[PDB]
From Swiss-Prot:
Encoded in a type III-A CRISPR locus. It comes from Streptococcus thermophilus. CRISPR (clustered regularly interspaced short palindromic repeat) is an adaptive immune system that provides protection against mobile genetic elements (viruses, transposable elements and conjugative plasmids). CRISPR clusters contain spacers, sequences complementary to antecedent mobile elements, and target invading nucleic acids. CRISPR clusters are transcribed and processed into CRISPR RNA (crRNA). Csm functions as a non-specific ssDNase. Base-pairing between crRNA and target RNA to form a ternary Csm complex activates a ssDNase activity; target RNA cleavage suppresses the ssDNase, a temporal control that prevents uncontrolled DNA degradation. Viral RNA transcripts probably tether the Csm complex to the viral genome, recruiting Cas10 ssDNA activity which is able to degrade DNA in the transcription bubble, spatially controlling the DNase activity. Belongs to the CRISPR-associated Csm5 family. The lineage of its organism: Bacteria, Bacillati, Bacillota, Bacilli, Lactobacillales. This is CRISPR system Cms protein Csm5. The chain holds residues 103 to 153 of 357 of the full protein. Signal peptide: none annotated. Part of the Csm effector complex that includes at least Cas10(1), Csm2(3), Csm3(5), Csm4(1), Csm5(1) and mature crRNA. The Csm complex is elongated and slightly twisted with a maximal length of 215 Angstroms and a diameter of 75-80 Angstroms. It has been modeled to have a central protein filamant of Csm3 subunits along which the dsRNA helix of paired crRNA and target RNA binds. The filament is capped at one end by Cas10 and Csm4 and at the other end by Csm5; ssDNA is thought to bind to the N-terminal HD domain of Cas10.
Length: 51
RNA sequence: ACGGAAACCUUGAUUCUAACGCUACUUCUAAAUAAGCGUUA
């Protein structure tokens, strides 16, 4: 819709920042993505024993 | 008017010198601030 006409953008989800206000990507986020990739492609972790 | 009188068990002395409540030890281990959008129109 038009951002200056209706309610439109009421809330914006903030990006992660440090104490200086500069955005960055935490290592925990990339590590979680890498861990998902590794766990899904290892047959000894992607089995019914994972539940 | 007594085997009695007179006579300090007294003076000077530091329970003192030396000695680390010390040696070794990561508040550590895994962990995406992320998932779901139905039904009506």
């Amino acid at each position: 819709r038009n951002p200056n006409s209706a309610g439109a953008i009421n809330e914006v989800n903030k990006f992660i920042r440090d104490a200086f206000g500069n955005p960055y990507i935490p290592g925990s986020s990339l590590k979680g993505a890498i861990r998902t990739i590794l766990m899904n492609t290892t047959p000894k972790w992607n089995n019914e024993n994972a539940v």
